[PDB]
Amino acid sequence: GRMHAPGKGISQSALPYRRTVPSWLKLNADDVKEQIKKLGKKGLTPSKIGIILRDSHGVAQVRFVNGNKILRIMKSVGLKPDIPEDLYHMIKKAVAIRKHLERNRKDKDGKFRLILVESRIHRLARYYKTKSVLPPNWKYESSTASALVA
Amino acid sequence: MGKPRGLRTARKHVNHRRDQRWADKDYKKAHLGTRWKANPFGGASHAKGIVLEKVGVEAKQPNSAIRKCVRVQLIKNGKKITAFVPRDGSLNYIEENDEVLVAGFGRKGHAVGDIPGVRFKVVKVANVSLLALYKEKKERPRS
Amino acid sequence: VRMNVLADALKCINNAEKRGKRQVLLRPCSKVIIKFLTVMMKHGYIGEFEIVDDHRSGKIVVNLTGRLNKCGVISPRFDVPINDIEKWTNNLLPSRQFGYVVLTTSGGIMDHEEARRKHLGGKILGFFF
RNA sequence: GUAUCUAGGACUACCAUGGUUGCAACGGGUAACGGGGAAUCAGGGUUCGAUUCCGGAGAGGGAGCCUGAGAAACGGCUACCACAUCUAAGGAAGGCAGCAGGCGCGUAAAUUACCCACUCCCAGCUCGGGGAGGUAGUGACGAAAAAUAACAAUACAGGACUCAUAUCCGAGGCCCUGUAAUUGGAAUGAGUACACUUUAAAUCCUUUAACAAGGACCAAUUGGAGGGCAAGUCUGGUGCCAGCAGCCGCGGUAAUUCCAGCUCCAAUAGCGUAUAUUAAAGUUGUUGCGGUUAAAACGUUCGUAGUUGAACUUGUGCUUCAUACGUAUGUAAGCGUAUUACCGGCCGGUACUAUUACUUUGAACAAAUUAGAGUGCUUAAAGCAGGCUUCAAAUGCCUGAAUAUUCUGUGCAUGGGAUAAUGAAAUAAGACCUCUGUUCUGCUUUCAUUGGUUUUCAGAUCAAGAGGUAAUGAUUAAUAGAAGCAGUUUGGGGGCAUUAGUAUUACGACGCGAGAGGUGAAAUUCUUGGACCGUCGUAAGACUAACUUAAGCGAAAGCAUUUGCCAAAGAUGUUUUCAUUAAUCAAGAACGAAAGUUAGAGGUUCGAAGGCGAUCAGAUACCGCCCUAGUUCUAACCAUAAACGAUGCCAGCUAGCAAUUGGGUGUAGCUACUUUUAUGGCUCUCUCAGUCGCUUCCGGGAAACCAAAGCUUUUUGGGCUCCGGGGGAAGUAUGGUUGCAAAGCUGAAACUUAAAGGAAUUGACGGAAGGGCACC
RNA sequence: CAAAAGUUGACCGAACUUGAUUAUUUAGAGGAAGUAAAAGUCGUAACAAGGUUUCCGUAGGUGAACCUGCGGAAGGAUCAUUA
RNA sequence: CGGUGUGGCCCU
C-alpha cells in the first residue's frame, strides 16, 4: 500500500454496524438539507462540509439519516461546481510547486515532488475523464495551474 | 518471484522463449546457420579429400606421444585439413597424395584424446577400405 | 492487492494444521466461497465453519477436525471440456483412490466424479486432499 | 468511364488526403513449395516432411503470342540471350527436371528389358494406341519370415539316487549332464533337376519324379573383454617406445587397457564407422528447475503500451410421489410468482425473448496413414480376403471392407446458466399491458372498372395525457486506494537567508634561549640572534567533532552549528469525503557521492602526478619534505559504483522474546511545583507502522546462515516484470545510438578448454592469534 | 469483293550500357589482441596480517605484475561489552 | 614495529 511511499501504514475511519442510529437525534435529514444550503454555499469542500456536522450538532453519519451521497446532496439543491474537490486540493498543492521552485531551484528533492502530483493528476484525472464528471479534451497545462485554482 | 501465469499472455509467452533460444550454447549448432561456415569440411558426413603431407604433431601433456598425422586438401571447398591415422604402422599404407575419404572424430567437433587441433579420423584411403588392411582381408593396390 | 479472493482464502487453511491451528480466522465472505466450504463438509474434511457479516464484506471463522493434507488451487480458471478432465487428475492427485479436484461448470460447483456423472465441462478453481 | 468472360486503383483521367504499426507493422535473412503427413515416449513435444496422395508452380535465361472450350503450352511457334548442332559457307536445326543411358559433379543412387493380361485413358472407337501401367534383371535402403543340424548307449566329470561309512571315504552310481574330428542311428531341405504350375510369354514363390552330409563338409560372424559397461589381475612381445582410448585414464623393463595367441563375452545375418535428431534432459521448463552467494535484480522512483484485478447482483426450503431402504434422498410436480400470450387432448400447434467468453450435444467436413472391430494370406509383416450341412450334388447365404482420433483449428447449430467481464434509470424514460393521437408517415381494400371528395381502418412508426398506481429511479466503502482535516505533531530529508565554534595557515608584536620536524633508524626541510615555543591579535578558507547510537528522516545516492523563512512527505488521530480512482511494469521521462571534463570564481588543510632522502640487489613503492591536478561554492555536463542487506517491488497466514522509534490510549501511576493541581517529566498497561537483536523449526535449504530466502511439498499455481545455461573467447570486435570528452545504454563468432567454483571436514598451540616446555 | 508484302500510332517488353544499392566471399605491406606457454629471461602481485591488508566506479602515471588519490563496501583479521 | 625475494618437470 501507500503508492508513492515506502510505508505499509494504514489510517482511516471506522464505521459502526447499524445504519439508523442516532435515533435519539431530533435533527432530521431536512434541516441538514438546509445546512448544506446554508454552509456549503460558502465554498466549502465536500469533505469539510461533512466534518462540521460531526463536531457541532453532532450527527454521526449523514448516510444514515439520508440515502444520497453528499455530492448528490450538493447536486439536488445545486451545489456541485465545475471542478471535483480532491484534485482541486492536488492542483493547489501542484501550484505551490510552481511557487517554491520558480525561484528556489536546485531542490531536486522538491523537484522530485513535481513528478508525483503530475502523475497523481494524470493517473487520477484519467479516471474522472472516463466517469463524465468533466469532459474529455481536458488537458492539464502548466500555465493552467494558476487559473484552475484561482 | 516471476514466471508469467496470466491467462491471456501467450503472445508474450513464446516471444520470451525465442528471445532465449540462443542462450543454450549447444543450440546454435544449426540455428544461426554456420554449418556452411567453419565445420572445416562442408557440413556433410565425410570428405573425399586428397593427401597433402605427413605432419609431426605431438600429444598433449604429460604424454610425450607422436600421433604421426597427415595433411589433407578437399575438392569440395578447398581448404587446409589436418587429420589423424590409427593402428600403428600404415604410414606405409598412406602413399601420399591419394584420394582419401575422411570422417569425423567422435565428439561432435572437439579435440578428443591428447591430440590437439585434429577434428577428424580417417576410415578410408584410395577407395580400397583402409580398415581391413591391417587384418589383410583386402589386398592393397600399390600402383 | 487482493488479486484472487479465492486462492488466498484457501492457503491459510493449509497454514493452520502445520502448527496445529484448530481454528481459522478468515476473510472476506464471497458467495462463490460459500459454495466451496461445504464441499469439504460434504466429505467431512474440516470442522464447523461460520460467517459473521460486517457491512463491508463479512468474515469467516472455520474450525477444523484435522483430517486434511493440503488444499490447492490452479490459477487462473482454465477452461476444461469433458474429454480432457482426466489429464487434471493424475497431475493433481496422488491416485485414483481418494482426493478430489473441484471445477465448476455451467451447472454449478461440484466434485469431479460428480461431474463425471453430471457430464458437463467446466473451469478448474482448485483441488484438495 | 475504360478494358476485361465479370468484381474492381485492374487501369486511364478528375477528386479526397488516406490505408498501416510496438497486439513486432514495412525491411532484409534463410543450405524454406505448402499440406495430407513421418520418425521417438509418461504426457507437453521439439525436429523435419525433396519424394507415389492432394494442391500450387516450371520446362536453359527471360519475355510476347497463334489455334482451340481450355495453354502464355515448350515431346507448338517467335524473338533475344547463354551454351552447344550441321554446312558445298549461300542455309537449317536445339532442349532428357518423359523413359533408359553416359558425361560432369559431389560422401551420394538401378536394364540403352519385356508387355498392354491388370488398372485408367485416347478417339471416328468393343477392335487402334499409350518405357501410364504391369512384370523381370538391378538393390544388406528397408520391413516381415526364419537353415546351420536333431536323437542313441558307452563314454568321461558333477550331482541326486542305494549304501558302506560319516572332521574322512567309496561302490549300486548316474532320468540327468558335458566332452567326445570317440561310435553312431544317420533325421533331413537348401542346393538339385523331369514334369507341373503361375505368366502377355518367361522366370521366381508353392507343388515337385530324379538328387542331396561322419563333416575336412551343405563351414557365420563382427566387435570386444581396466572402470563406465557384459566378461582372462592367461601367455609371448614391447619398453612413455609404438600405441590405446568417446570420456576416467593405462604404456617410463617383473604392463589386468598396446601388438599377437589364449580363452571369455556381446548381438547375430548382422555388426561398425562417422554425421545430423529426439530421448536420456525437469542441462529450453506452463505444467517443470534457478537468482543470498555455485552463471546470475535494472542503483534508483514515478510511468503509459502490457497484463492481472476485491466483495456484493433469486433461492435454501415447504408438501407429495416415483426411490434408496420404519428409514434414506441422488429423483418430478405443487409451493415464495414473465412456471411466456392463443387454439386444441395433463397433453400437439402457434404469439413470442440484454450479449459475449466458456462449455454441452452436434452439424458440416477426401482418403491413405495412426489407433484399429472382423479375419487362421501355412505364420508374420500382410491383406480384405473369403466363410459355407455342402463331404454324394456346391446355387453357396453372406460377413464384409466397420469405429473414432491426427477428419488438429478458427467460424457455422444446440444444451447450459456457475465462472469471466460487458450491459440500463441521474441535463431526467419511471412506466403505461394499452381503448391507444392531444403525432400524422397514411397503406390497400370495398365503393363492378375509376379517381375528385374523408372517414372507419388508423398493419403502423413519430410528438402525446395533467390515463402521475409508479417504495417513482444512486451497492458496501474493502485491515483496496486516494483526497480531507481545531488536528497533536514528528526528522542530521530538502530548499534559503542568517549565524557559531576550536584548531590550522601564515602574518603581526613581545618573551626568551638553538634547535625544530620527521623515522625501525636516519635523512630530505626549518633556524642566529629569534625558529620551534608561550602570548594576545589580524585575517583566511575548509569543516561543523564532541554529544553519535547496532538512533531517526529520505525513494535511493546521500543527509549533522543556530534561528527565521519557504515548502513537501510518513505515521498514528478520524461514526470526513470519494466511489475501484488498483498492483507491478518494454518503450520512456526526473534523480545518482566522487573520479572526471566545459568557461567564471575563490584559495586553507591535503593531494595522483613531478622532483629529492632513505630502504632495497632494484623502489619508479610501502616512510618522510615540498608543492602540482583538484576536493570548495555558483552555472551546467556525462549517469556509471561492491549504487550491498552481493536478497526487486504489493496482497495473506504462520513464534516467540527483548529492546526502541514516533502516534494513540489506560494509569484504578509517581514526580515536578504555578498549588495538592494544572500544562510537564518518567514508570506501568494497551496499541497500531514496525526496525533491530536473540531464541529454538517444531519450515526451508548443498551448507553457513533465513522468520522469511518459509507457504515454490506431493513430478505445483497469490499477481506482474527483467534476467542466467560451464570456462575462458569477452563486456573485446562490428556497426548503428548517445557524450564537448574520458566514454555508455547496447553485444556476438570461429577458435580453444574437462573443468573454474559453492559451503563444509581434516593437515598449520607452514614467520597468524591466545597458553605452557630442553643449554638438539 | 476479299486480299500478301511495306508500315504510323502505340502497347507489353527480351536483351544490350552506365550509375547507385542489398548481403556471402576475397587479396593486403605493416598495426594489435587472444590461447597454444610446457625445457626461456626479469621480477613477486594475489592467497596467513602474502609480509604495504584486500576490493570496485574512475582519474593520473612506470618494463610489467602493480603503485598512487578521492568516494565506498564487507567476500576482514572487528558480529564485542568496555559505565 | 627495522629485512626475508626464489625453489627445472613426472612417479600406490
mmCIF file of C-alpha atoms in Angstrom, chain C residues 55-109:
data_model
loop_
_atom_site.group_PDB
_atom_site.id
_atom_site.type_symbol
_atom_site.label_atom_id
_atom_site.label_comp_id
_atom_site.label_asym_id
_atom_site.label_seq_id
_atom_site.Cartn_x
_atom_site.Cartn_y
_atom_site.Cartn_z
ATOM 1 C CA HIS C 55 -21.473 -4.393 6.377
ATOM 2 C CA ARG C 56 -18.323 -4.194 4.309
ATOM 3 C CA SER C 57 -17.559 -7.786 3.282
ATOM 4 C CA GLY C 58 -18.163 -10.294 6.064
ATOM 5 C CA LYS C 59 -15.505 -12.623 7.501
ATOM 6 C CA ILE C 60 -15.361 -16.347 8.165
ATOM 7 C CA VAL C 61 -14.488 -18.411 11.212
ATOM 8 C CA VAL C 62 -13.512 -22.013 10.451
ATOM 9 C CA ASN C 63 -12.990 -24.817 12.920
ATOM 10 C CA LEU C 64 -11.027 -27.838 11.754
ATOM 11 C CA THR C 65 -11.077 -31.541 12.615
ATOM 12 C CA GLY C 66 -7.528 -32.161 11.382
ATOM 13 C CA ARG C 67 -8.103 -34.652 8.568
ATOM 14 C CA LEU C 68 -6.685 -32.564 5.753
ATOM 15 C CA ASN C 69 -3.348 -32.874 3.994
ATOM 16 C CA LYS C 70 -3.300 -29.938 1.547
ATOM 17 C CA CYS C 71 -5.921 -27.941 -0.324
ATOM 18 C CA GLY C 72 -4.749 -26.336 -3.549
ATOM 19 C CA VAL C 73 -5.641 -24.093 -6.441
ATOM 20 C CA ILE C 74 -4.845 -23.867 -10.148
ATOM 21 C CA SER C 75 -4.718 -20.333 -11.339
ATOM 22 C CA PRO C 76 -6.495 -18.842 -13.149
ATOM 23 C CA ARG C 77 -9.663 -20.679 -14.118
ATOM 24 C CA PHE C 78 -8.512 -22.861 -17.011
ATOM 25 C CA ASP C 79 -11.315 -23.934 -19.359
ATOM 26 C CA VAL C 80 -11.704 -27.725 -19.387
ATOM 27 C CA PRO C 81 -14.077 -29.751 -21.610
ATOM 28 C CA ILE C 82 -15.359 -33.231 -20.792
ATOM 29 C CA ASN C 83 -12.938 -35.391 -22.796
ATOM 30 C CA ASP C 84 -9.884 -33.873 -21.095
ATOM 31 C CA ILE C 85 -10.778 -33.863 -17.389
ATOM 32 C CA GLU C 86 -8.672 -36.997 -16.782
ATOM 33 C CA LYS C 87 -5.479 -35.070 -17.513
ATOM 34 C CA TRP C 88 -6.160 -32.970 -14.431
ATOM 35 C CA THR C 89 -6.500 -35.985 -12.153
ATOM 36 C CA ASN C 90 -3.099 -37.664 -12.450
ATOM 37 C CA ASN C 91 -1.170 -34.404 -12.381
ATOM 38 C CA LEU C 92 -3.029 -33.204 -9.303
ATOM 39 C CA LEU C 93 -3.988 -36.149 -7.263
ATOM 40 C CA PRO C 94 -1.922 -38.839 -5.515
ATOM 41 C CA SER C 95 -4.008 -41.617 -7.065
ATOM 42 C CA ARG C 96 -7.402 -42.510 -8.464
ATOM 43 C CA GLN C 97 -8.388 -43.758 -4.993
ATOM 44 C CA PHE C 98 -9.059 -40.647 -2.916
ATOM 45 C CA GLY C 99 -8.689 -36.900 -3.222
ATOM 46 C CA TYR C 100 -10.858 -34.541 -5.231
ATOM 47 C CA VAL C 101 -10.137 -31.837 -7.742
ATOM 48 C CA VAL C 102 -13.010 -29.363 -7.923
ATOM 49 C CA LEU C 103 -14.028 -27.497 -11.052
ATOM 50 C CA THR C 104 -17.210 -25.611 -11.839
ATOM 51 C CA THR C 105 -19.266 -25.884 -15.000
ATOM 52 C CA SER C 106 -22.406 -24.077 -16.158
ATOM 53 C CA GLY C 107 -24.498 -26.203 -13.778
ATOM 54 C CA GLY C 108 -22.598 -25.277 -10.634
ATOM 55 C CA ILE C 109 -19.796 -26.289 -8.302
#
